[model samples]
Target: ATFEIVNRCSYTVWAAASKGDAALDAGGRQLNSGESWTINVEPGTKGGKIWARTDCYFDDSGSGICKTGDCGGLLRCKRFGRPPTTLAEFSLNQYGKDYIDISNIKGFNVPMDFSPTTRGCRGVRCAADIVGQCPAKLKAPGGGCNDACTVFQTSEYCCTTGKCGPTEYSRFFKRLCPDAFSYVLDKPTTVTCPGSSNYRVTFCPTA
Candidate 1:
C-alpha cells in the first residue's frame, strides 16, 4: 500500500511511520508547510502507525528530539513514538481488505485526516481544536493534548484489565474528535477499504 503524507499546517512537521521492526521513510522526515512525502508498504503489514512530530531539531546523523512525538530522541525511530500526538493506524491486505483508523489513544497534537484514495471508501478525520481546548490537567508540555491514561495512569483511563469504560476525560476527547479512539478500549472506530486502495494522511487538515 502507498501512503501519501501531507503537511498542511502552517508550521514545520516531521512525519514518521513504523511497522513492526521496520521504519518507513527512515522513520521520519521533515516536512515544511505544504510539503508531502510518500511511503510504500508491503502486503500483510500490521500494527503500522503514521504520525507527526512537532518542534524538532535533528542533526545530520538523524539525532534529535521533538516537543511532541519524540521517539527516543532519534530521527530514525525504531518503535512507537511518545504520547500526545495523533496517529493514522493501519493494517494492509488483511484478508483482502485494508483496515484503517485515526487514533487519539496516545493524545492529540495536530488535526488529521486519514482517508483512502480509491475504492469509494469513506474518510475519517480528527480535526478538532484539541490543543486549544485541552484541559489543563491533561495538557502536555508542548501544544498537545494528552490522553487521560497518559496523565492519570489509572485503569479507568488505561483500561489495563481489558474491562473499563470512558471517563470524563475520555469523553472530552470523544466530544471533540468523534472519529478517533478516545481510550484504550473505546469502541472500534476502524474503517475498511479495498486492499488495492492507497491512502492519504494529512496534518492540520482544514476539512
Candidate 2:
C-alpha cells in the first residue's frame, strides 16, 4: 500500500514513518506547506507509525531537534518519536484487511486526517484546535499537549494495570476529536479498510 503524507500547516514539517526496525522514506523527509511525500508500504507491515515533526532545523548530516515529535534528534529515525505528537497508526494486510487509526495516546501537536484513497472507505480526522485549548497542566513547553500519563505517570492515567478508564484529561481530547483514540483503551475509533487500499495522511488538515 502507498501512503501519501501531506503537509498543510503554515510551517514546514518533517514527516517520518517507522515499522518495527524498518525505516520508511529514509526515516524522515522535509515537506514544506502544501507539499506531499509518498511512501510505499510493503504488505504485512504491522505496528506502523506515521507522524510529523514541527519547528526543526537539521544540518547536512540530518541532525536536529524538533519542538515536537523528535526521534532522538536523528534525521533518520530508527525508533519511535518522543511524546506530544499525533500519530497515524496502521497495519496492512492483516487478516486480509487493513487497520488504521488516529491516536492521541501520546498527545497531540497538529490536526490530522487519515483516509483511504480508494474503496470508498470512511475517513477519520482530528482537526480540532487541541494545542490552543490544551489545559495548563497538560501543555508542553514548546508546543502541543501532553497526555495525562506523560504528565502524571500514575496508573490511572497510564493504564499500566490494564484496567483503566477515561479521566478529565482524556475527556478533553475526546471532546475535541471524537474519532481519535484519546486513551490507551480507546477502541471505537479504529477503522478497517480493504487490504489493497491506499491512504492519505494530512497534517493540519482543513475540513
Candidate 3:
C-alpha cells in the first residue's frame, strides 16, 4: 500500500531527475520513462536521488524530460538527507511500494525493504540491483555512446533458489526475501547524474 511520488523539492532527496529517466522503485504501475531509480543506500546525511521524470514539479530546476510520449507530473523520490549510516537507514527498492510512500523524515528515513536506489544520469554513482547485476563498469562519461542504461523498480529473474523467483518484467512485490542488495560500479569519478539534463556529464562512464 505504497505508491505516491509528488515531492516538489524541499528535500526531494538531493535534487536531479527529469525526463522519462525512470520511476517505480518497487515495480507497481509505471514503466518506460527515464530509468534507473535506486536502492543500495549510503549517503547518511544527504546524497539521495530518484529522478526519472514523471513531470517533476518540486522546483523543476532539477531538470526536465518526456518529449510528448506522456510523462505526467514527474518526481519520484526517497532520500531524505545525505545518506551514509549503514546506508542512511535505506529506502528506494523492493518495488518502491508500487510507486512510493516514504516519509519518516527527520534527516530522512525511507526504507521498508531494501529501498535504496539513485542515478538517472551523471558521472558515476551506481547501485540498484536488489541484490545482483547492473555493475559492469558503469561507463558512459566522456566516452558517451549511449548503448545501455536501465535499472528500475524490480523484476527479472530465473532464480532456481537464488530467491525473488521468476520475473521477466511486470513488477511490484518488493521484499519476500531473495537477494536483497549487492552492487558496485565505481572507477571514473567526477560525479554527476541528474536525469535528462542538469549537468549530465554523460553519467560518468570511466575508462
Candidates' C-alpha lDDT: 0.87, 0.89, 0.23
Off by over 4 Å in 2: none
Cα shift from native, residue 51, model 2 (Å)? 0.6
- Return model 1's CA RMSD, one decimal: 1.2
- Per-residue C-alpha lDDT of model 1 across residues 1-207, encoded as one tens digit per residue: 788999999999999898747686568789899998888877778889999999999998988889999888888777788889899999888898988999898999889999887876798999988888988998888769999888888887889889998888889989998889998888989998888689999998893
Q: Which regions in candidate 3 have their CA more than 4 angstroms from the true location?
A: 1-48, 52-71, 75-202, 205-207
lDDT of 2 by residue, 1-207 (tens): 789999988888888898757687578899998998888888878899998888888999989899999888987776788889899999888888888999999999889999999885798999998999999999999789999999999999999999999999999999999999999998678898888789999998893
Candidate 3 residue lDDT tens string, 45-141: 1223333222223334332332111133233322221211112111222332111211111111111222213334222222222213212332222
TM-score of 3: 0.19
